[PDB]
Paper text:
Animal coronaviruses (CoVs) [name] (formerly named [name]) and [name]-20-52 are phylogenetically closely related to severe acute respiratory syndrome coronavirus 2 ([name]-[name]-2), and [name] is the first observed animal betaCoV carrying naturally occurring Y501 in its receptor-binding domain (RBD) of the spike (S) protein, a residue related to human adaptation and broader host range. Additionally, both S proteins lack the PRRA insertion on site 681, resulting in the absence of furin-cleavage site (FCS) facilitating S1 subunit dissociation. Determination and analysis of cryo-EM structures of their S proteins and RBD/hACE2 complexes revealed that Y501 shows a synergetic effect with R498 and inter-replaceability with H498 for hACE2 binding.
For both S proteins, only a closed conformation was observed, with all three RBDs in the down state. Notably, in our [name]-20-52 S structure, three free linoleic acid (LA) molecules are observed, which are embedded in hydrophobic pockets within the three RBDs. Comparison of the hydrophobic pocket surrounding the LA molecules reveals that Y365 in the previous structure blocks the gate of the pocket. The RMSD of [name] and [name]-20-52 protomers from the PT are 1.798 Å and 1.692 Å, respectively. The compact packing of S1 subunit suggests the preference of [name] and [name]-20-52 S proteins to adopting a closed conformation, consistent with the fact that only a closed conformation is observed in structural determination of the two S proteins. Notably, N370-glycan forms van der Waals (vdw) interactions with Q493 of the adjacent RBD, thus strengthening the RBD-RBD interaction and stabilizing the down state of RBDs.
Author numbering:
A (entry chain C): 297 to 622, 637 to 676, 685 to 740
B (entry chain A): 692 to 1110
C (entry chain C): 988 to 1085
D (entry chain B): 741 to 789
E (entry chain B): 938 to 987
The structure:
């Protein structure tokens, strides 16, 4: 049926008919994550009593925690959530490497500027993001906390600078900025300005003039060891079987086996020339395991025509005639080409009919069955050598033969526009 | 400045002639490819690598896959028919006779040696040893590659990615048997078995027929039979010495093997390139992105890998054309140099041709050509046409020459003073 | 979307033309061989072994066919034989006669 | 001669190496063709008066 | 005059192939332009990559 589907016809002629390969299916799934028990500090990070100013923004480090963000559902409501290098539906199945958290306060109509590739006051002189950024950006309104009846002026931002900032850099200088050609030398005056300025927040001002709280998270996903992981339960380790695995957020299928290579303390998994993962270190028991594919291949099918019969024989290129390495009925024969199942070996030598390989051919004959044999080169013969004996022919024959040679092939022309656009 | 060669000159004199007093028998070697390695490719294993999300998106390119596989199948069948056309001219195996006295002629080194496996000639044994093959058969089991993880052998690497090598139909022993039958027939019956049944004839008779073929009379052999037999023995000794002394002899066959291996290895290495995708690993993409966003990257990877496979197939087709031309030339030279003696110039060896012998080789054949070359010469005086009694008399077969007082007639390829 | 389709269809056409070029090269080789066969077996008697027939050559006839040509080669083959006894020459009056 | 490009071409340098190998093979073949046609004899004979 | 045709055809074929290779640089393969300097002048790296 496989060769029928390959040929896209319901009738099949005689031949050897290379099939696809030999494949094995997984039967089990395993998950291995490091053991972390403590919940991750959401209440400290998102929910602080005070937040920093945008120019003097804050950075915090997060490690050895479990990232279960479902505990924020009854506590917080968010107005903006966007992730860049990762899909938001895959966050429950991963582990994160070098997490940091940044926090500050801006206006309502300036939250759009916290994104790569932007321009403006905040993006130019206060806070800059890299073009190749991997992480998520969160924001939510904070009018009921950061506004006072008289007006709150504790939050500050920068207004003038000679040049734009580089990504993830901070300046807290207070030197006087000069606009005209007259030198300043301190003493703010006509063309001298104090660089920093203060927001003014009131509980009755417009939506775009209301304070917002912003948190930016950055991380690397796969390479390097990780200590912050999602809320997924772990299982036991299974060796020497084809299983589906999940090592620190990396998914695949294969067979796991103990390894001899030794990793340096800052390495987690390794690759080959094809950049495929072939080794991994178990998070719980610090041991090195190898990964090997399950499918290996080498299958072909020998058949006469479907009009004649429905019997077949199958050839496996690399097997010492046992259970197929990760269906024996009665007849098993071994050849230098491989193990042949479904044919009867015969000692007699005939003319080759269907070529198998390594000097073995097959044919269909008489109750009809498929036989395999060593092909006959021809009729054995010899010539007597005798030098004092010579032989000369006394009749001859006149004969005619036939020879067939192609000369030409069909001439064709193509119109691009009609074939492509039509 | 590169030297074309030693400058020389010939002194043209219209009343002089030079005729070779002596000659040599020289044998040379010639090396020709016949077939290449046969390969087949699995698309799904090379492109998707046992992922179910992939190969559900390859249903739009299975047609291109079928086309590629069709081309490779054609190449394989072509290689088999090339071997058939080169070696399977005769269907009558001629058993090697009991080694008899051939008049000093020594085919012991070109005939099979029973005291060794496979019953093959010592020269063929040396030729088989000189060329290396990076295949070591095809029996590599799953456990063999599973256990030998530390040794990163290339065969397991290219077999885990869907690239496999199929064995040729005719084994080495069968080809040795073909060659042995050819040599036995050509040393007993001469040129007869090419056209009609084989007729027995002495070897001195057959090679005296060869001398009559080149235009040199039989008496040159007959007065010097032992000398010429020793000469041919010396020539075959020169060939054994030349083959044994210089390791750098078989280059074209080795180049064919190396080219095939390099093509497969570069196909394996080209999996590390990302064709504008975020990564070259499907597992990473499927770990980080949801399906609607992963489809774009997977599509880029699929396009690139199909392009790589198509390039490989095109190169294979062109190389197959080259090997087909070489195989046709080998078949023609076999027919015209061991089934007969050729009047063509510089075809079965430099010089006036005598005969040829085949020896088997991996992916090719080696021809030992036996030629004729005149040795040192001596100048003489001649006349345009010796007129005796007013009617211009002309010789039938030779050329009239004189020492200065007497006139003699002699042929061209060899000096024969006769009246 | 239209650009994706355009690129794919151009690739298909280029593949077709490359295969046609290779096949045309093979057919040209066959045509040259056939031309030499005509010139050397139909306009003359060839001394080449196994070129204008399986044996000693006499002649050949051409016949036309769609996209090809069929050759009828008339050949000489020796029939049944008899063994005798031979020597290099005969010494009658002391001088070898060949 | 743009630096932003050829920093993105490290993913295709392999295909470039393949193309260059093919072209070099063609060049060596052309030289061998000329030598096989014209260099049959190594003794250069000078034309007589 | 029309005697040495095949040699001239070889020369013409090679020259025409090289000139066609030069002329193919004017096509944009679904991009906004066929000039790298134009793209690098108008767009930032993450958008110029495509
Ligand atoms: C303390 C901040 C998080 C630290 C650990 C996180 C590492 C990598 C981030 C993964 C995304 C989930 C955490 C942020 C919550 C998303 C907002 C939401 O639920 O809508
Ligand atoms: C995880 O737990 C296992 C015991 O179940 C212990 O051997 C291992 O050291 C622990 N390691 C981590 C990563 O916490
Ligand atoms: C969710 O929060 C509200 C308001 O703080 C509270 O009344 C309610 O009990 C909470 N629900 C749970 C399950 O804690
Ligand atoms: C912040 O934490 C305090 C307890 O310290 C809690 O009362 C408050 O509701 C939290 N705010 C949010 C929005 O999480
Ligand atoms: C870094 O310092 C130099 C030297 O003072 C200055 O010219 C440059 O503008 C600074 N970088 C930024 C992004 O301001
Ligand atoms: C099968 O096993 C035998 C014994 O180990 C070995 O000689 C042979 O090569 C194996 N394979 C084949 C093709 O028989
Ligand atoms: C042929 O060889 C035999 C020895 O094998 C010898 O007796 C005989 O005289 C030789 N005769 C001829 C015709 O060469
Ligand atoms: C053999 O030759 C004779 C004489 O020409 C002839 O009569 C006879 O028919 C020939 N043999 C055959 C089989 O024709
Ligand atoms: C040979 O050439 C000489 C002069 O070069 C001339 O006198 C003579 O007749 C020529 N003889 C023949 C046979 O050509
Ligand atoms: C001809 O050359 C061979 C080759 O060495 C030599 O043995 C033989 O003596 C030579 N004959 C004459 C007459 O010079
Ligand atoms: C020549 O023949 C003899 C047998 O008479 C044999 O012993 C010797 O090895 C042969 N020399 C070769 C094949 O070089
Ligand atoms: C030429 O050969 C004859 C042999 O018949 C000889 O007598 C004569 O002296 C030779 N000529 C010379 C110049 O030696």
């Amino acid at each position: 049926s496989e060769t029928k589907c390959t040929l896209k016809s319901f009738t099949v002629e005689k031949g050897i008919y290379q099939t696809s390969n030999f494949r094995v299916q997984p039967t089990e799934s395993i998950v291995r994550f490091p053991n972390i028990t403590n919940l991750c500090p959401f209440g400290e990070v998102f929910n602080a009593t005070t937040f920093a100013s945008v120019y003097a923004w804050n950075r915090k480090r997060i490690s050895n925690c479990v990232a279960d963000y479902s505990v924020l559902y009854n506590s917080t409501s968010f107005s903006t959530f966007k992730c860049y290098g990762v899909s938001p539906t895959k966050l429950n199945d991963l582990c994160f490497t070098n997490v940091y958290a940044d926090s500050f306060v801006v206006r309502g109509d300036e939250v759009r500027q916290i994104a790569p590739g932007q321009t403006g006051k905040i993006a130019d002189y206060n806070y800059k993001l890299p073009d190749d950024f991997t992480g998520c950006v969160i924001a939510w309104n904070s009018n009921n906390l950061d506004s006072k009846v008289g007006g709150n002026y504790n939050y500050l931002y920068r207004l003038f600078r000679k040049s734009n900032l580089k990504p993830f850099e901070r300046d807290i200088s207070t030197e006087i900025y000069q606009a005209g050609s007259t030198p300043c030398n301190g003493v703010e005056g006509f063309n001298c300005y104090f660089p920093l300025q203060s927001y003014g927040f009131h509980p009755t001002n417009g939506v775009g003039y209301q304070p917002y709280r912003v948190v930016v998270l950055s991380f690397e996903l796969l390479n390097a060891p990780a200590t912050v992981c999602g809320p997924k339960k772990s299982t036991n380790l299974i060796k020497n079987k084809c299983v589906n695995f999940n090592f620190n957020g990396l998914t695949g299928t294969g067979v796991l086996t103990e390894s001899n290579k030794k990793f340096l303390p800052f390495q987690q998994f390794g690759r080959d020339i094809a950049d495929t993962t072939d080794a991994v270190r178990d998070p719980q028991t610090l041991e090195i395991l190898d990964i090997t594919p399950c499918s290996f291949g080498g299958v072909s099918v020998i058949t006469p025509g479907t009009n004649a019969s429905n019997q077949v024989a199958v050839l496996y290129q690399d097997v010492n005639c046992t259970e197929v390495p990760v269906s024996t009925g009665s007849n098993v024969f071994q050849t230098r080409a491989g193990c042949l199942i479904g044919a009867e070996h015969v000692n007699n030598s005939y003319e080759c009919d269907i070529p198998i390989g390594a000097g073995i051919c097959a044919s269909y004959q008489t109750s009809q069955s498929i036989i395999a044999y060593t092909m006959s080169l021809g009729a054995e013969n010899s010539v007597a050598y005798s030098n004092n004996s010579i032989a000369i022919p006394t009749n001859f024959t006149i004969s005619v033969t036939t020879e067939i040679l192609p000369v030409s092939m069909t001439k064709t022309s193509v119109d691009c526009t009609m074939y492509i656009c039509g | 400045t590169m030297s074309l060669g030693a400058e020389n000159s010939v002194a043209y004199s219209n009343n002089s002639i030079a005729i070779p007093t002596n000659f040599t028998i020289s044998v040379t070697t010639e090396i020709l490819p016949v077939s290449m390695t046969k390969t087949s490719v699995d698309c799904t294993m090379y492109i998707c690598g046992d992922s179910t999300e992939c190969s559900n998106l390859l249903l739009q390119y299975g047609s291109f896959c079928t086309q590629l596989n069709r081309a490779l199948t054609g190449i394989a069948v072509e290689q088999d028919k090339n071997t058939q056309e080169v070696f399977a001219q005769v269907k009558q195996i001629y058993k090697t006779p009991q080694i008899k006295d051939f008049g000093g002629f020594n085919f012991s080194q070109i005939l099979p040696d029973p005291s060794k496996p496979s019953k093959r000639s010592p020269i063929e044994d040396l030729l088989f040893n000189k060329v290396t093959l990076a295949d070591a058969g095809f029996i590599k089991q799953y456990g063999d590659c599973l256990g030998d993880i530390a040794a990163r052998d290339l065969i397991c690497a290219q077999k885990f990615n869907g690239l496999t090598v199929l064995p040729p139909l005719l084994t080495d022993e069968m080809i040795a048997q073909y060659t042995s039958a050819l040599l036995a027939g050509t040393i007993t019956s001469g040129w007869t078995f090419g056209a009609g049944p084989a007729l027995q004839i002495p070897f001195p008779m057959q090679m005296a027929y060869r001398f009559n073929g080149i235009g040199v009379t039989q008496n040159v052999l007959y007065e010097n039979q032992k000398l010429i037999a020793n000469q041919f023995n010396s020539a075959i000794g020169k060939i054994q010495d030349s083959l044994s002394s210089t390791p750098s002899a078989l280059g074209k066959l080795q180049d064919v093997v190396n080219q095939n291996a390099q093509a497969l290895n570069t196909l394996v290495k080209q999996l590390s390139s990302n064709f504008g995708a975020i990564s070259s690993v499907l597992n990473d993409i499927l770990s980080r992105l949801d399906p609607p966003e992963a489809e774009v990257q997977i599509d880029r990877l699929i396009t690139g890998r199909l392009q790589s496979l198509q390039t490989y197939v095109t190169q294979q087709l062109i190389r197959a054309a080259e090997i087909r031309a070489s195989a046709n030339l080998a078949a023609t030279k076999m027919s015209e140099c061991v089934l007969g003696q050729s009047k063509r110039v510089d075809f079965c060896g430099k010089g006036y041709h005598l005969m040829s012998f085949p020896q088997s080789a991996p992916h090719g054949v080696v021809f030992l050509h036996v030629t004729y070359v005149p040795a040192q010469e001596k100048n003489f005086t001649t006349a345009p046409a010796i007129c005796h009694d007013g009617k211009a008399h002309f010789p039938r077969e030779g050329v009239f020459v004189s020492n200065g007082t007497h006139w003699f007639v002699t042929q061209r390829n060899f000096y024969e003073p006769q009246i």
